[PDB]
Amino acid sequence: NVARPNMTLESEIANYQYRVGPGDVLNVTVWDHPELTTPAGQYRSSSDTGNWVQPDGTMFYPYIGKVHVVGKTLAEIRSDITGRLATYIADPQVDVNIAAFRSQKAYISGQVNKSGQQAITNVPLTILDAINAAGGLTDTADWRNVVLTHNGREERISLQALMQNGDLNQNRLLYPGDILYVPRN
Amino acid sequence: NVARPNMTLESEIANYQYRVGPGDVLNVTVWDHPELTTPAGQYRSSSDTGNWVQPDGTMFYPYIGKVHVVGKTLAEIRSDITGRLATYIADPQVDVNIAAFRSQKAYISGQVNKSGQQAITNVPLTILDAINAAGGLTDTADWRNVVLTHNGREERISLQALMQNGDLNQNRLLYPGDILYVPRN
Amino acid sequence: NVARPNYQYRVGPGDVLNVTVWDHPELTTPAGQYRSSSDTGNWVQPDGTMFYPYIGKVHVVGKTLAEIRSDITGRLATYIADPQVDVNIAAFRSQKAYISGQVNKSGQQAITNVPLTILDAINAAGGLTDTADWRNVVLTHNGREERISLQALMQNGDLNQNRLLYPGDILYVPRN
Amino acid sequence: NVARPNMTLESEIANYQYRVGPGDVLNVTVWDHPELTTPAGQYRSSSDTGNWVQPDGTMFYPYIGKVHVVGKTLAEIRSDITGRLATYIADPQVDVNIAAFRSQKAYISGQVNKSGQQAITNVPLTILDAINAAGGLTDTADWRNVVLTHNGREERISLQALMQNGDLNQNRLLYPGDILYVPRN
Amino acid sequence: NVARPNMTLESEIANYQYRVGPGDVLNVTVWDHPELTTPAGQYRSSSDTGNWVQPDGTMFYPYIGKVHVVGKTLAEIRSDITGRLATYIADPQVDVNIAAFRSQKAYISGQVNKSGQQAITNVPLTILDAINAAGGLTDTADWRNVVLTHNGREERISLQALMQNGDLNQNRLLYPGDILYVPRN
Amino acid sequence: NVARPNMTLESEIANYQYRVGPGDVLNVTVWDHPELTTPAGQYRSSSDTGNWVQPDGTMFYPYIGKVHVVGKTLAEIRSDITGRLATYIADPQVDVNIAAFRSQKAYISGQVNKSGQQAITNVPLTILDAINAAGGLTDTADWRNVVLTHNGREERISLQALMQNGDLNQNRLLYPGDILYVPRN
Amino acid sequence: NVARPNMTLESEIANYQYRVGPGDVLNVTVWDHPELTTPAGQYRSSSDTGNWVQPDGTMFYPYIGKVHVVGKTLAEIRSDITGRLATYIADPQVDVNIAAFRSQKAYISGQVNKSGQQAITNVPLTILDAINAAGGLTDTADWRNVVLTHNGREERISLQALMQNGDLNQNRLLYPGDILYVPRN
Amino acid sequence: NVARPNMTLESEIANYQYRVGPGDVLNVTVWDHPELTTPAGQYRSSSDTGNWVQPDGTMFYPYIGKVHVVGKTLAEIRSDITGRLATYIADPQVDVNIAAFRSQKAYISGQVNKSGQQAITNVPLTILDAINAAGGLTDTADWRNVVLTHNGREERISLQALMQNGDLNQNRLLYPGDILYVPRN
């Protein structure tokens, strides 16, 4: 055997867009307004000082009040906060990113060297990324019969074919809640 | 098998909300009022400088005095503090989050790679989350007969089914004081 | 074994306290804002007092944080109008329990403002070793020995095996 | 065992040019304008304060708005931003670099001492770089039959020739998405 | 096997009084006088900026000169320094604690998991404290026959009786110069 | 065999001169102008704030614009920059060093305790320096037949004589692109 | 043995007085003169900012010039410096301590757990201190026959008698240059 | 036999004097001139901000330009700098030390626990220092026939004699370039 690529995976990475979910910590920057950008000062990390997304899908932001952010992209949230701050600040220059990815994760467990949660973020997490992020497989992984649970199905995945034969069809884009289990040999 | 739907598990997790308990350390941000936000300076962390929730369920806040927070969400506390601070500050802009989740915890132990307490927080902690946060299982886990102690009942849980067949009915949301024990087989 | 569903710290000598006086950083952070609160906090003396500026010696041992907050506030009112004060503990040094034997991390565990039960302490010690005589754990409390089965606690959910640990308690997990 | 050059390797390294991709974190210096260079102050790292590249290929920048940066080099982005800031700022002195390389990566797994993703950056990553960055091969690497998966086809590489005899014909430039797999014998 | 109360051990611990020795590093706080409290600024640790006790028992303090501190309690040193500073500052508010306990120590050696010096401090150090601070005993510890050397006298101690039978008469307060030796089985 | 003095290998080092390559990060100090030396403040390290050398061999510098630095020594770049800054500041006092050596490197693998890339910097890196920098040989090194690939030609090297006989003849100066392989005994 | 005392050692520690050597780093505090106390600012450690003692036994100090310190005590040095600063500063309040003990050291090698040099400092270092500071002995230490080299003479020490029988006569004060070797059993 | 002192150990050490080499990083303190002492702020380390000695023997210093420092002592460099600064600053108070010893090094390989380079610094580094600086010998070390390569001549050294018997003639002072090899038993 040799290759068996997948430019169909080119697709879910093409339009890949993260959407904010509850428990995320947002970091809002208002240029020329350090009283807004760093209300607790400059030393603490943005995740220790950022805005928490509540379970009802909003975050509080000063002057404008509650802002619905769940299910929106960063650019939409940036656009929505900017337009509402315009009431209180003339021509606000605002950006928004995510200080802590907490709402969405995948579960990479089994015969990997580090098991555990991996966040879904603004960057695509494929099976390839998660296995390499979990630090590769142990010597005793059944790397021909990796189990991916996604939206109610199981799918068998052959990492062996992915890496030793370049069968890119074995790669998948991971979604919130997915389980990637590497059984023991 | 395949992944079987849980009418219970994903309705517990959309409605999922944390309520403050005694011993939590809260963090209160008052925009334009660094003398309230950071009375001890910008450099210490929010848990080293936050407001402790006392056994009686209150925390002290300056000017407004004792604030009853136990049993309330962050949004309910934000509103409570905002309305009371408005006596001393015109139109106060206030948010509240948690610097230290110390009041509520689940106990994850036995044949896990990292035994011990895991805090209950504003992010759901399911069995799947807790096992992954505990580093996964040891090679000698009786992982078909995990014991969940919850509300004075013992439930038996197959992590084998959850991760190798995708059986999401094997998942549970973990609650404060729950015990999740993984025996040796 | 069954399955059931269902605390005030008091300051002692050697505790390091941390007093916040809003709008008075000269009181809150006399040594600056970088050092941790335990490196700048007020030490509780053997006689049960701590020094606080302008008010002098404050008796704190045997009191709750709220009692110390109220005591300090009443007295600072002589020197500062309407003082806004809180007090918490930056180092829990006076009271502890001893968790030893076949646990993965043996040692002292602090008694704090948060209840520390047996269950808390064993998980805090990182669980039992594989050679723990875990059915016959010894708790020493107030001069009297007691038999604790963590087996029944975790294998069967028997919460009657749990106990709130107290200052001075010894929880010893033997080898079988 | 005599060493030789390479078609692929060296025609493409003197030209080597990184191009920004989505998810990268950019760092923009505007001399004499700390309100622009450091809106969140001076303590947090570049990647904690930098500008995120959005999935549509743009980044926001104050006053000049959205800026298309994907596919472009740092020098070009510096010129783009400089030209646009000149509307708002007299003679702006701008530089741009990358605080976090997150869009592009190679996968280096198998019998190397440190498996995992390696970022594609402004410095070339050749096979020789990537193996050394992984701490070399284990004692059990089939180091004459390494599998490079690039553009959907496999190529067998002899690290033994490369790393013991400096045969650069075995060295390749690694590209975003390449899998370099060291099988065990 | 009922637990035995120790005769004069909590009599000894309720009167427990640290007294300063040569080499201790003290920390003096003079409220409203940061020029005195933090002469080297407020970033270095109090032990990096503290006052050293000299062999002759004195420490230097600005304006008041050398102060005799060895043999005294913190509360006594505070009182001595305050009365002296009142010559140079009106109603000085002073506290004193110890940034480094360097003068006095016990030695905990043998079949414990962590051998070494243990500092004598304002907090009573009992055998039970020191053994627990050493991390417990190895499994080869002759733990029925521990040897306490104190003031030129040998004592046999049974940690086995202390920990498995709660015999608190086995516990002892440790003093400067004491040797606690845990032999091999 | 013998342990001789030296000739021409001394000028090779006494004339040793690093020259800047693409991807180096430079650090320019302008005394009395913290707005140029540290445009992003004083806390971030020089390599997080310094000036990247682009592929085309230049770095941008405020007010003087692009500056050719590849191939030049630090002293020459300092001269070049000073003369040009004199147009915007003058009697301008300027120094230049390298915050991150990223462009040039040697590769050290085999039976060393620490395979990997070693940077070529302003301090000469000899084989001995590389081997010691690589943690020392393993117990199973063929330290009589270490292979040095430099500019295509391969060369038997005997670390053995370099240390059990102090034969400085075997040692060599490492150059950018050099490979050094320590074979299994 | 019983814990028979060492009587000269009882009073040898009384006269214990460190004296400054070449290479030591001193830290001079001048209250009300942070330009003298912290000429490099408040952030770097004392040992990064201290005054080096030169090989001639002198150190430079601003305004007063060059100061003989070797062979002298901290309190002697403090008086020397205070008296000469009174020219340039009114009623100077001065203290001196060592930020880095680099000049004097004892060698603790052999069957100790952590072998290496141990600094001679203002705090006495006895054999008892040094071995405990070495975290104790290996299981194969001939702890009955430790060898102490001091001012040329040799001198047999029973750590066995010291620690298990309390024999303080086996303790000794370590001086600069002393070698203490725990033989193989 | 009789226990011997040494015939050169403490005049080579009593006259020991480091001299600056290329690649050293120097640290120049000008009291009352923070703009000269900390041009990059007070937070970065001395070695992150110090003055690099160029291969030609010189370092740049503001106002006075090139300063020849190689082969000079610290005291000499301090005078030279002071004198020329005096042209520009009224009576400058200057000290100089070394933030990074990068020019001169000894190599200690063989049956020591941590091989590698050891810098030559302002404090003497005898064999007795470098071994303990490597913690010490593996217990499989030919510690009777340790080879020291200095200035071309081999020479045999017995570390067993130095420590079992306190023979000081075995200990030697290490010079730049020296190689000290510990053979395996």
Topology of domain C96-173 in CATH is Outer membrane lipoprotein wza fold like (3.10.560)
C104 contacts in chain B (CB < 8 Å):
115
CB–CB contact C86 B60 (8 Å): yes
CB–CB contact F74 H63 (8 Å): no
- Domain range H9-15+103-182, CATH architecture: Roll (3.10)
B10-15+104-182 — its CATH code?
3.10.560.10
DSSP-derived secondary structure letter, A5? -
CA distance G88 to H93: 13
Task: Enumerate residues 6+ apart whose C-beta is below 8 A from C99.
Answer: C106, C107, C108, C109, C121, C122, C124, C125, C171, E132
CB–CB contact F164 H181 (8 Å): yes
G166 contacts in chain E (CB < 8 Å):
147, 149, 152-154, 179
CA angle E67, E73, E74 (to 5 degrees): 75
CA distance B60 to B48: 15
CB–CB contact H45 G44 (8 Å): yes
The distance from CA F71 to its chain's CA centroid, rounded to whole angstroms, is 13
CB–CB contact A42 D41 (8 Å): yes
The distance from CA D72 to its chain's CA centroid, rounded to whole angstroms, is 13
Name residue, tokens 């590249």.
D53
DSSP-derived secondary structure letter, E134? T
Nearest CA in chain A to D180: A163
Of G24, G10, G8, the closest CA to residue G176 belongs to: G24
D143 contacts in chain F (CB < 8 Å):
none
In chain H, ranges of CATH 3.30.1950.10 domains: 24-100
C107: left (phi over 0), alpha (psi -120 to 50) or beta: left
Topology of domain C15-91 in CATH is wza like fold (3.30.1950)
Of E89, E125, E109, the closest CA to residue E182 belongs to: E109
Phi, psi angles (nearest 5°) of residue G130: -60, -45
Are there at least 3 beta-carbon pairs closer than 8 Å between F and B? Answer: no
Name residue, tokens 């193989």.
G184
CA distances from G133 to B130, E117, F162, G130 (A): 41, 7, 37, 5
CA angle B179, B180, C1 (to 5 degrees): 60
CA dihedral B55, B58, B60, B66 (to 10 degrees): -130
CB–CB contact B43 A48 (8 Å): no
Are there at least 3 beta-carbon pairs closer than 8 Å between D and G? Answer: no
DSSP-derived secondary structure letter, F53? P
Q: How far is C166 from chain B (nearest CA, A)?
A: 17
Yes or no: say if B87 and B63 are a contact pair by the CB < 8 Å rule.
Answer: yes
| Neighbour-count burial for F86-121, b at 16+ CB within 10 Å, e otherwise | eeeeeebbbbbbbbbbbbbbbbbbbbbeebbebbbe
In a 13 Å sphere around the CA of A126, the CA atoms on its Cβ side amount to 25
CB–CB contact F56 D75 (8 Å): yes
- Write the single-letter amino acid at F86: A
Cβ neighbours around E20 below 10 Å, total: 24
DSSP B9-32: HHHHHHS------TT-EEEEEETT
Of H93, H34, H85, the closest CA to residue H61 belongs to: H85
Phi, psi angles (nearest 5°) of residue D34: -65, -25
Q: Determine which helix (DSSP H) or strand (DSSP E) holds B179, and give its type and residue range.
A: strand B179-182
H166 contacts in chain G (CB < 8 Å):
147, 149, 152-154, 179
D93 contacts in chain F (CB < 8 Å):
62-63
In chain E, ranges of CATH 3.10.560.10 domains: 9-15+104-182
G133 contacts in chain E (CB < 8 Å):
116-117
CA distances from F117 to A127, F173, F178, F180, H111 (A): 29, 15, 10, 10, 25
CB–CB contact A42 D39 (8 Å): no
Strand-by-strand arrangement of the C85-91 sheet: C42-43, C16-21, C85-91
| Neighbour-count burial for H66-88, b at 16+ CB within 10 Å, e otherwise | ebebbebbbbebbebbbebbeee
Yes or no: say if G106 and H127 are a contact pair by the CB < 8 Å rule.
Answer: no
Which residues of chain E approach chain G closer than 8 Å at the C-beta? 22-23, 35-36, 39-44, 48-49, 51-52, 54-56, 60, 62-63, 102-103, 105, 107, 109-110, 114-117, 147, 149, 151-154, 179, 181, 183
E110 contacts in chain G (CB < 8 Å):
136, 163
Of E141, E154, E148, E156, the closest CA to residue E180 belongs to: E148
CB–CB contact B149 C126 (8 Å): no
Q: How far is E170 from chain G (nearest CA, A)?
A: 18
Nearest CA in chain G to H166: G149
B32: left (phi over 0), alpha (psi -120 to 50) or beta: left
CB–CB contact H43 F38 (8 Å): no
B166: left (phi over 0), alpha (psi -120 to 50) or beta: left
3.40.800.20, 3.10.560.10, 1.25.40.10, 3.40.50.300: which CATH number matches A8-15+104-182? 3.10.560.10
CA distance B102 to B51: 12
Token code pair at residue E5:
């109360």
Topology of domain F24-100 in CATH is wza like fold (3.30.1950)
Yes or no: say if D146 and D183 are a contact pair by the CB < 8 Å rule.
Answer: yes
Yes or no: say if B174 and B134 are a contact pair by the CB < 8 Å rule.
Answer: no
Nearest by CB: G164 against E52, E152, E181: E181
Nearest CA in chain C to B24: C114
CA distance D148 to D110: 12
CA distance D75 to C24: 50
Of A19, E113, E64, A62, the closest CA to residue G136 belongs to: E113
Q: How far is B24 from chain C (nearest CA, A)?
A: 9
Nearest by CB: F43 against H22, H36, H43: H43
In chain D, ranges of CATH 3.10.560.10 domains: 105-182
List all chains that touch chain F, counting a touch as 3 or more CB pairs closer than 8 Å.
Answer: D, H
3.40.50.10260, 3.30.1950.10, 3.40.50.2300, 3.40.50.300: which CATH number matches G19-100? 3.30.1950.10
Task: Enumerate residues 6+ apart whose C-beta is below 8 A from B149.
Answer: B178, B179, B180, B181, C3, C154, C156, C157
DSSP-derived secondary structure letter, H77? H
Cβ neighbours around B94 below 10 Å, total: 25
In chain G, ranges of CATH 3.30.1950.10 domains: 19-100
Burial class for C114, CB neighbours closer than 10 Å (0-12, 13-18, 19+): buried
CA distance E179 to G163: 7
CB–CB contact A117 B132 (8 Å): yes
E116: left (phi over 0), alpha (psi -120 to 50) or beta: left
Yes or no: say if H181 and H147 are a contact pair by the CB < 8 Å rule.
Answer: yes
The distance from CA G173 to its chain's CA centroid, rounded to whole angstroms, is 12
Which residues of chain A approach chain D closer than 8 Å at the C-beta? 2-3, 5, 7, 15-17, 29-32, 34, 37-38, 41-43, 45-46, 73-75, 78, 93, 95, 97, 99, 113, 122-123, 128-129, 131-133, 135-136, 162-166, 168
Mutate to test the interface with D, among F149, F150, F151, F184 (most CBs of D within 10 A): F149
E76: left (phi over 0), alpha (psi -120 to 50) or beta: alpha
Burial class for H138, CB neighbours closer than 10 Å (0-12, 13-18, 19+): middle
A152 contacts in chain B (CB < 8 Å):
2-5, 166
What distance separates the 2 farthest-apart alpha carbons in chain B? Answer: 64
3.40.50.10190, 3.40.50.720, 3.40.1390.30, 3.10.560.10: which CATH number matches G7-15+104-182? 3.10.560.10
Name residue, tokens 């009297």.
C144
Nearest by CB: A154 against B2, B42, B99: B2
CB–CB contact C47 E75 (8 Å): yes
Nearest by CB: B37 against A39, A105, A152: A39
Q: How far is F49 from chain H (nearest CA, A)?
A: 11
CB–CB contact H38 G40 (8 Å): yes
Experimental method: X-ray
> Alpha helices of B46-144 — where are they, by DSSP H?
46-49, 74-85, 127-133
CB–CB contact G3 E110 (8 Å): no
CA distance B110 to E31: 52
Nearest by CB: G97 against E52, E63, E152: E52
The distance from CA C113 to its chain's CA centroid, rounded to whole angstroms, is 5
Assess if CATH 3.10.560.10 describes domain D105-182: yes
3-state DSSP assignment of residue D115: coil
Nearest by CB: D179 against A17, A43, A166: A166
Residues in chain A: 185
Mutate to test the interface with A, among B4, B80, B164, B171 (most CBs of A within 10 A): B164
Nearest CA in chain A to B100: A48
Of B33, B27, B35, B37, the closest CA to residue B122 belongs to: B27
- Domain range E9-15+104-182, CATH architecture: Roll (3.10)
Strand-by-strand arrangement of the D51-52 sheet: D51-52, D25-30, D94-100
- Write the single-letter amino acid at F80: D
CA distance A134 to A113: 6
CA distance C113 to C115: 7
CA distance A177 to A164: 28
CB–CB contact A116 B136 (8 Å): yes
CA dihedral G81, G86, G91, G97 (to 10 degrees): -10
Resolution at which this structure was determined, Å:
2.3
DSSP chain G: ------HHHHHHTTT------TT-EEEEEETT-HHHH-TT-SSS-HHHHSEEPPTTSEEEETTTEEEE-TT--HHHHHHHHHHHHTTTSSS--EEEEEEE--S-EEEEEESBSS-EEEE--SS--BHHHHHHHTT-B-TTB-TTSEEEEBTTB--EE-HHHHHHH--GGG--B--TT-EEEE-B-
Of G167, G108, G169, G118, the closest CA to residue G138 belongs to: G108
Token code pair at residue H160:
């067993």
Q: Which residues pair with G28 in a beta bridge?
A: G96
CA distance C31 to B89: 30
Q: How far is G18 from chain H (nearest CA, A)?
A: 18
Q: How far is H118 from chain F (nearest CA, A)?
A: 10
Of C134, C124, C131, the closest CA to residue C98 belongs to: C124
CA distance D65 to D85: 10
Are there at least 3 beta-carbon pairs closer than 8 Å between A and E? Answer: no
CA distance B46 to B48: 5
Token code pair at residue H182:
């510990």
Nearest by CB: C123 against B56, B109, B184: B109
Yes or no: say if D138 and D113 are a contact pair by the CB < 8 Å rule.
Answer: yes
- Write the single-letter amino acid at F119: A
Q: Which residues pair with A113 in a beta bridge?
A: none
